[PDB]
Amino acid sequence: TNTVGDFTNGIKDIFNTTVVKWNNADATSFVVVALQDDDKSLLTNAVINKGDLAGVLVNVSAAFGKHVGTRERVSGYLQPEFGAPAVIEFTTPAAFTSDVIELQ
Amino acid sequence: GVTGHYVKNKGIDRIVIYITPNAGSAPIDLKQCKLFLMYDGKAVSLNFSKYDTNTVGDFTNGIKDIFNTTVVKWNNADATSFVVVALQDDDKSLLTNAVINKGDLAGVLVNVSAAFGKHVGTRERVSGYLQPEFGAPAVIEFTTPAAFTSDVIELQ
Amino acid sequence: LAGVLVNVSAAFGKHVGTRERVSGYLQPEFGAPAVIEFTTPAAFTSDVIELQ
Amino acid sequence: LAGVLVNVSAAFGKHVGTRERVSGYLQPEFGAPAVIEFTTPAAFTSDVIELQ
Amino acid sequence: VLGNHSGGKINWLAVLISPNAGSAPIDLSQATVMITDGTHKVIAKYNSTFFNGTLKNGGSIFEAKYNNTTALKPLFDDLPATAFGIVVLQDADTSCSKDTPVINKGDIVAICLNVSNTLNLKPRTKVTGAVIPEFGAPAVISFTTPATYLDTQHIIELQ
Amino acid sequence: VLGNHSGGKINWLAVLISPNAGSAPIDLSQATVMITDGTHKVIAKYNSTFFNG
Amino acid sequence: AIGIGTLIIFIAMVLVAAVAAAVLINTSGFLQQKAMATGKESTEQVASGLLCS
Amino acid sequence: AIGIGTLIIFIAMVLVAAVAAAVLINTSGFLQQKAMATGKESTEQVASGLQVIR
Amino acid sequence: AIGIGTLIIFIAMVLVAAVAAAVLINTSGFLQQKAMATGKESTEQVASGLQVIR
Amino acid sequence: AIGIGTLIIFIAMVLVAAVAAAVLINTSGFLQQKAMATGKESTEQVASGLQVIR
Ligand SMILES: [Ca+2]
Ligand SMILES: [Ca+2]
Ligand SMILES: [Ca+2]
């Protein structure tokens, strides 16, 4: 119902379904959750400016059609309309052993 | 070093912590440093406070007994502060605006029984740090012995 | 090499204390200005101090 | 990776002895030259030596 | 990092933090903290209600009060599940004010978080996280809770 | 490195090898090995006939 | 007459600097990945192990 | 005019040097935790044990 | 003519590179003293002491 | 036309940047040998010696 999910004041758990509303993460889109934004730019027409921090949610298992396994790499770029793209690159660890993992 | 005073049938009432700067350290502005101490149920921060009428108690020429009340003036050791007694200082830095520099030795007095609200008993540990405004903190750590048996004890 | 003398306590109307910064520029009639910037130390302990 | 063979004893007219240095460059037609530099060891003691 | 304990858990954490040498002033009112126990990942932000300045002059952490208008009440017990509070432990130049906590060279301040229901910190549990400022490099929280908690030692030093 | 022995000599060597941390994949079919005993200097290259997976 | 040309070559200066900047920015990106990877991998190698009891 | 490009390339040079600095700051963070833990843990291991009285 | 600007910007480039070099030379000076002293002092500390004979 | 000079000064700029690069390539060569030798030699020194049996 709103352009960007307003969690400027904190989240109990970023992955709990009822709190966060993952449902619009279809196999072909992402959604954005606003974590810090003084000037209300994220919250209104979705513009990042200086000092903002925002989180992109992707339903990977639906996007790639399967769950990513251990010892596998994933790489990409988030490419804006103008300007340099943010590189993403990580290799999933050898041993999954906890529910939330810091791929970093 | 650390040393401490035992009141009979009660426990350790007060403690004196001896402190010195490390080789090559730049001068440390003692009056801004804070001392954090942990014990069985409390974690307390204490801030510098002036000795009577003067910044640091001048005992550069010796003390009959560091714990005798009338000589030493313990009274400003409130439940939230410490006071500093200057034991060796050639250049008069401690004595004037409270700055430790090379070769100085000074003693911090803490009224532990007032700070933690009770006397510390036998077989108990206390640990902390005296953290300066910049630079590395002095670690404090000791376990009170099993049997108190004399008035002044060398917790060290 | 030349040395500029300034009576700071008269210029600013008080003596500058510890932990305070002072910054400025000496600006010539033409050409680039000399930047000045320093923070007075935490503990004054000698008469002549090398603010540098 | 390729290996250049040189008949040193014929090139310099004598065998190179112990404790002696030899230095040079292989200079291509364009681009940076490969530097060569080594000092023969103090004690020859095996037939093939790793001057490296 | 320090941590009160009752029951089978660590229930409050107090994360003491200070500027890096030569840093420009950091405005904590715009910081964000992120913590995970490997089963959940909370993110929390400053609620101005929970400030205690007085402790710059000494006192007990973990028993600090705060001021809802007309009363004084205990800080840690009241702090909401998605928020962090702040307690000034050293500040020479009164730079921290309740509406604008800006820390400058020399200051030390404790970020107070109540984790009792949000993260399940039983023994032998890894905790990972960061305090992320508006600009500049994050502080990294990283500790594993002890193997044994003892009833004689309710305050624990974690990092 | 491991080495079978008969008679008065070591006759076969088996040199176990693995990548350095963070290395890109190495194609051994284009490697070269060089060994010397101080009297001779052999250089040897991969013959695909001799693989056991 | 002179004015016209000045404008045109100015445009080229801009574009050529832009193209060069792209190289530097991109390349920095390409290296960022491998730089981190190498450090993490190397640490995990030195720190980890098993011990016979 | 030559000035125009000199400005633009400076912008790039700054940005690249920033990115390069970042990786070292980040990596130093990663190593900090790993180092500190390794020391603590190793110490506790040596220091501790049990003894059979009778 | 294009040459005119090329000259002028070179003058600037030199000057900036000079200033940048300077800070490293200066800083190396500052660190020299601090390092040398720290070593000396620390050495004397370990090396020295008194012993009670009787 | 302005274009004429722009071309000519580019030729110069390239050439200067070449010369500047060269000195670093050359110097890296000089340092290579000096470094490698210093390490080898120092190692042999520590590693070697004689022992009087009787
Ligand atoms: Ca914004
Ligand atoms: Ca002194
Ligand atoms: Ca401050």
Side-chain angles (χ1 to χ4, degrees), chain H:
Chain H
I2 184 60
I4 299 295
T6 304
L7 292 155
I8 294 166
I9 203 66
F10 147 90
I11 295 167
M13 206 74 56
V14 169
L15 285 172
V16 165
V19 173
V23 88
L24 300 171
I25 301 291
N26 288 359
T27 299
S28 187
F30 165 71
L31 280 166
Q32 176 155 37
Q33 52 185 34
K34 213 79 163 187
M36 292 279 259
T38 294
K40 179 167 181 175
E41 199 158 319
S42 297
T43 302
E44 294 179 315
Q45 164 59 24
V46 173
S48 306
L50 296 172
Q51 173 176 336
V52 270
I53 315 167
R54 279 180 291 274

Side-chain angles (χ1 to χ4, degrees), chain B residues 106-125:
Chain B
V108 184
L109 309 189
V110 284
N111 186 342
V112 53
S113 66
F116 295 165
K118 72 166 170 187
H119 303 279
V120 302
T122 54
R123 308 195 217 122
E124 278 171 6
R125 60 192 295 262

Side-chain angles (χ1 to χ4, degrees), chain A residues 26-27 59-68:
Chain A
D26 288 331
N59 186 341
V60 53
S61 66
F64 295 166
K66 72 166 170 187
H67 303 278
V68 302

Side-chain angles (χ1 to χ4, degrees), chain A:
Chain A
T1 303
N2 303 264
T3 56
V4 169
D6 174 26
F7 289 98
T8 309
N9 308 353
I11 318 183
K12 181 168 181 175
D13 181 31
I14 301 153
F15 290 104
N16 188 306
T17 58
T18 65
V19 177
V20 173
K21 279 191 180 173
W22 273 75
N23 71 330
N24 278 0
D26 288 331
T28 58
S29 76
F30 62 89
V31 292
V32 181
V33 156
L35 291 166
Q36 161 63 16
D37 170 29
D38 174 46
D39 49 281
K40 303 102 176 71
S41 62
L42 297 182
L43 303 182
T44 326
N45 303 317
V47 178
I48 289 186
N49 56 29
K50 291 170 180 180
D52 299 345
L53 164 74
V56 184
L57 309 189
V58 284
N59 186 341
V60 53
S61 66
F64 295 166
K66 72 166 170 187
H67 303 278
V68 302
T70 54
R71 308 192 216 121
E72 278 171 6
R73 60 192 295 262
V74 173
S75 186
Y77 304 86
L78 203 142
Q79 175 57 71
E81 197 144 77
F82 65 91
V87 295
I88 293 174
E89 208 297 331
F90 58 96
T91 175
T92 56
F96 296 144
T97 192
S98 202
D99 296 339
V100 52
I101 52 182
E102 206 75 353
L103 302 154
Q104 194 186 339

Side-chain angles (χ1 to χ4, degrees), chain B residues 88-94 99-104:
Chain B
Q88 161 63 16
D89 170 29
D90 174 46
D91 49 281
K92 303 102 176 71
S93 62
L94 297 182
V99 178
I100 289 186
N101 55 30
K102 291 175 186 183
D104 299 345

Side-chain angles (χ1 to χ4, degrees), chain C:
Chain C
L1 164 74
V4 184
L5 309 189
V6 284
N7 186 342
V8 54
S9 66
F12 295 166
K14 72 166 170 187
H15 303 278
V16 302
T18 54
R19 309 188 217 122
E20 278 171 6
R21 60 191 295 262
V22 173
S23 186
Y25 304 86
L26 203 142
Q27 175 57 71
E29 197 145 76
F30 65 91
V35 295
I36 293 175
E37 208 297 331
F38 58 97
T39 175
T40 56
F44 296 144
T45 192
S46 202
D47 295 340
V48 52
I49 52 181
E50 205 75 353
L51 302 153
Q52 194 184 340

Side-chain angles (χ1 to χ4, degrees), chain B residues 32-34 36 38-47 80 125 129 131-133, chain E residues 2 16 56-63 89-90 92 106 108 152-155 157:
Chain B
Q32 287 291 118
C33 300
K34 253 63 173 176
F36 293 97
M38 293 171 273
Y39 168 60
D40 80 352
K42 294 283 288 174
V44 173
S45 314
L46 304 168
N47 69 310
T80 58
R125 60 192 295 262
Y129 304 86
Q131 175 57 71
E133 197 143 77
Chain E
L2 304 179
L16 276 64
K56 68 190 82 192
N57 290 327
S60 183
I61 303 162
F62 291 126
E63 210 165 322
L89 288 171
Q90 178 169 273
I108 303 162
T152 51
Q153 284 194 98
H154 293 295
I155 288 171
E157 180 180 73

